[PDB]
Amino acid sequence: SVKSEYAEAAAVGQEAVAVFNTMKAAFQNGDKEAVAQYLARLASLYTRHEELLNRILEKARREGNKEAVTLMNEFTATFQTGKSIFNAMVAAFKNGDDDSFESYLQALEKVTAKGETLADQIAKAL
Numbered sequence: 573s574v575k576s577e578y579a580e581a582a583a584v585g586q587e588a589v590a591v592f593n594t595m596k597a598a599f600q601n602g603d604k605e606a607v608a609q610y611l612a613r614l615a616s617l618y619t620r621h622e623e624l625l626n627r628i629l630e631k632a633r634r635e636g637n638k639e640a641v642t643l644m645n646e647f648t649a650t651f652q653t654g655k656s657i658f659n660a661m662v663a664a665f666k667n668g669d670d671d672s673f674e675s676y677l678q679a680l681e682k683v684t685a686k687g688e689t690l691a692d693q694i695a696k697a698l
């Protein structure tokens with residue numbers, strides 16, 4: 573069901589949260605080799621999450637579930653805000669700019685925290 577597809581998407585999102593916090597610890601400790609690997613792992617988790625969200629939104633549209641489509645249009649827009657901040661973070665790492673990396677990391681944390689009440693609303697709406 574689309575609802576169980578959203579639970580699968582939610583779990584992939586939680587996996588990225590877990591890997592992100594582990595990446596943050598490694599960054600603070602200066603373990604750049606670990607950070608590089610965690611960033612690759614996160615890039616894969618976001619690409620997976622983004623595609624699953626796209627399938628869920630498309631399915632909601634085909635089902636005519638207007639409220640779920642509204643919420644998923646907002647949530648996918650916000651996901652892209654997080655994604656853009658991720659890609660800038662990756663570039664900051666490549667460039668050795670730890671000041672920008674710290675900035676983009678905190679912003680990504682606050683954008684994600686903000687998007688959580690909506691994430692829970694979608695589960696109920698599908």
Ligand SMILES: O=C(O)CCc1ccccc1
Pocket residue numbers: 615618619622650651652653654655656658659680684
């Ligand atoms: O953290 C997010 O909100 C998603 C970030 C993301 C999404 C898709 C590709 C790269 C990063």
